[PDB]
Design a protein around this ligand. Structure first.
Ligand SMILES: NC(=O)C1=CN([C@@H]2O[C@H](COP(=O)(O)OP(=O)(O)OC[C@H]3O[C@@H](n4cnc5c(N)ncnc54)[C@H](O)[C@@H]3O)[C@@H](O)[C@H]2O)C=CC1
Length: 411
C-alpha cells in the first residue's frame, strides 16, 4: 500500500506514482482494449458523449451503433483495474452540470461574491445528481501551471473497488473512470489558487442499482425479490391488485387525478386504493434503485400539439427548464415505471424521460413478477409520490430531441 488516499497538493509525487501504475496496467490490456484507449486519447469528445446517452435507444439500435464496440472495450479496460483502497480525485466541472445556469465569476475577476456563493450553495445543496459516462480526473489538487477551465473544482472520494485506468497520452499522465452513480455535494468552500478564488465542492458517492439497457438482468432481479409477492397478499389485496392490472387502473387513476377523494368521495374506490397502497408497502424496494418512465406531454402541462412541446428549438428547452428544473412534481395517481432505459414501441414517440432514483425501503413492487405478466419489466410506485427534478438534459433521437429528467423520489 505505497499510496496515500489523497495526494492533496503534492503533484510531483502524484504523477510519479501514477506514471508507474500506468505502465503496470497497460501490460494487462488486450489488443481491443488498447485499440479503444488509443481511439479515446484521439477523440474523447465523441466517445464520452456517447457513453452518456447510449442506453436510451432501442436495443436494436444499440447493438448496431458503431461506437458501441468502442464503449464496451473501454468500459472493460476500466473495470479491469479495481483499486485496492479508496482514493480522492479532482476535476473541474461546469456549474451548468448542476443546474446552476449562471456564472460564478468571469475569468478576469479574482473574487466570488457572497450573493453568488449563497445562490450556488442553495442550488447544489440537498440534491443527488446522477453522473454517467467516461471522465478524465486528476489525482492531485490543481495548482500553479495546471489547467483550470472553470471556477468549480470537484473533490470526490471513490470507494474501495472502483475501476480506474491510469494512462499516458503524450507526455503527461491521465486518469479515466466511468461514472455510474449519483453524487451529493456535502460542502462547498472557497479556495485560492494563484490569486484567484475557486469553489471547491466536497462530494460523496451514492450508489444505486441501475440496469440501464440490460433489461434481462433487471428482470432477474425483479423476479428474485418479488416472485412470492403475490403469495403474501390477502385475498382482498390480491383481487384489487388484479383488478388494477386487468384494466381498473384507468378508473382508479382518473379518480385520484381529479381529486375524487376530496370532491366526490367514492367508498368503493378508496377501498381499492388502500389495499393497493398496503400491497406496495409489503415488500419495499430492497435497495436504492433507478427506474425509467417515458412521460406523455399531459404529465407536464403540455399537449401533443403544444408549440412549447417541440424541443427541437432550444427556446422550448429553456422554457421547460425554467418551469420544472429544481422543482417538485406530484403524481396523484399510482405511477408505472420500467427497470430498463431502452426505448420501446408504444412509447417511441414520447419526448420526456423521467429517470428516478428510488431510495431503499420506498413503497413499490415489481408487477412483472405476477403470474401472467411477463416481458414487461414494470415497477409500480405508490400514489401521491413526489419527485424532485434535479437536472434536465437533452439528446437527439433520430430527428427528435428528447429530454432526460434526473429526479429523486422524496415521499
Ligand atoms: N410510460 C412508461 O414509461 C411505462 C409504461 N408502462 C405501461 O404501459 C402502459 C401504457 O403506457 P402509458 O400511456 O404511460 O400509461 P399510463 O397508464 O401510465 O397513463 C396513460 C396516460 O395518463 C397519463 N398521466 C399519468 N399521470 C398523469 C398526471 N399525473 N397528469 C396528467 N396526465 C397523466 C400519461 O401522460 C398517459 O398518456 C401502461 O399500462 C403502463 O403500466 C410500463 C413501463 C413503462
Amino acid at each position: 500500500i505505497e499510496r496515500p488516499e489523497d495526494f492533496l497538493k503534492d503533484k510531483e509525487n502524484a504523477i510519479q506514482w501514477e506514471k508507474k501504475e500506468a505502465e503496470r496496467v497497460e501490460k494487462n490490456l488486450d489488443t481491443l482494449e488498447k485499440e479503444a484507449l488509443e481511439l479515446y486519447k484521439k477523440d474523447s469528445e465523441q466517445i464520452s458523449n456517447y457513453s452518456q446517452t447510449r442506453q436510451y435507444f432501442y436495443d436494436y439500435q444499440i447493438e448496431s451503433n458503431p461506437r458501441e464496440k468502442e464503449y464496451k472495450n473501454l468500459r472493460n479496460a476500466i473495470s479491469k483495474n479495481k483499486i485496492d483502497k479508496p482514493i480522492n480525485v479532482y476535476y473541474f466541472e461546469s456549474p451548468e452540470k448542476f443546474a446552476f445556469n449562471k456564472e460564478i465569476r468571469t475569468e478576469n475577476q479574482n473574487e466570488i461574491s457572497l450573493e453568488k456563493f449563497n445562490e450556488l450553495k442553495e442550488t447544489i445543496q440537498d440534491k443527488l445528481f446522477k453522473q454517467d459516462g467516461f471522465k478524465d480526473v486528476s489525482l492531485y489538487e490543481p495548482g500553479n501551471g495546471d489547467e483550470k477551465p472553470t471556477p468549480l473544482l470537484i473533490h470526490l472520494k471513490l470507494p474501495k473497488n472502483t475501476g480506474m485506468l491510469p494512462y499516458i497520452n503524450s507526455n503527461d499522465v491521465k486518469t479515466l473512470i466511468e461514472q455510474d452513480y449519483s453524487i451529493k455535494i456535502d460542502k462547498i468552500v472557497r479556495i485560492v489558487i494563484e490569486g484567484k478564488q475557486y469553489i471547491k465542492a466536497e462530494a460523496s458517492i451514492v450508489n444505486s442499482l441501475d440496469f440501464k439497457d440490460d433489461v434481462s438482468k433487471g428482470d432477474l432481479w425483479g423476479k428474485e425479490n418479488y416472485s412470492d409477492w403475490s403469495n403474501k397478499l390477502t385475498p382482498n389485496e390480491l383481487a384489487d391488485v388484479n383488478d388494477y392490472m386487468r384494466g381498473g387502473y384507468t378508473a382508479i387513476n382518473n379518480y385520484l387525478i381529479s381529486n375524487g377523494p376530496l370532491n366526490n368521495p367514492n367508498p368503493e374506490l378508496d377501498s381499492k386504493v388502500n389495499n393497493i397502497e398496503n400491497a406496495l408497502k409489503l415488500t419495499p424496494i430492497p435497495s436504492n434503485l433507478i427506474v425509467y418512465r417515458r412521460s406523455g406531454p399531459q404529465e407536464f402541462g403540455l399537449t401533443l400539439t403544444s408549440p412549447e412541446y417541440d424541443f427541437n428549438k432550444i427556446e422550448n428547452i429553456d422554457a421547460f427548464k425554467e418551469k420544472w428544473e429544481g422543482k417538485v412534481i406530484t403524481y396523484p395517481n399510482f405511477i408505472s415505471t420500467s427497470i430498463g432505459s431502452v426505448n420501446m414501441s408504444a412509447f417511441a414517440k414520447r419526448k420526456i424521460i423521467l429517470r428516478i432514483n428510488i431510495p431503499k425501503d420506498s413503497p413499490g413492487a415489481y408487477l412483472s413478477a405476477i403470474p401472467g405478466y411477463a416481458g414487461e419489466y414494470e415497477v409500480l410506485l405508490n400514489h401521491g409520490s413526489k419527485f424532485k427534478i434535479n437536472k434536465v438534459d437533452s439528446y437527439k433521437d433520430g430527428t427528435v430531441t428528447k429530454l432526460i429528467l434526473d429526479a429523486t423520489l422524496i415521499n
